[PDB]
């Protein structure tokens, strides 16, 4: 207990460092997902440009 505030604070720093790494990945992956979505839509809208040009 007595040193657990410290062990848990350091654990929290590490757990936060890891939730942060996971969260930073979430943000980076969020940026990539969005980039892929913009590119997907680039290609989906393009899919329609060709589909429409095709019909």
Site for a copy of itself in 14-33 (CB under 8 A): 14-16, 18-23, 25-26, 29-30, 32-33
Query: Could you give the dihedral angle defined by the CA atoms of residues 49, 53, 54 and 55, in that order, rounded to the nearest 10 degrees?
Result: 100
Could you tell me the smallest distance in angstroms from the CB atom of residue 6 to a copy of itself?
7
Q: How far apart are CA 49 and CA 16, in angstroms?
A: 46
Residue pointed to by tokens 């505030």: 5
Q: Which residues bind a copy of itself (CB under 8 A)?
A: 1-2, 4-9, 11-16, 18-23, 25-26, 29-30, 32-33, 36-37, 39-40, 43-44, 46-47, 50-51, 53-54
């Amino acid at each position: 207990l007595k040193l657990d505030k410290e062990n848990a604070l350091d654990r929290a720093e590490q757990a936060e460092a890891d939730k942060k790494a996971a969260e930073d990945r979430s943000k980076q992956l969020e940026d990539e997902l969005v980039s892929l979505q913009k590119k997907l839509k680039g290609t989906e809208d393009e899919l329609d440009k060709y589909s429409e040009a095709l019909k």
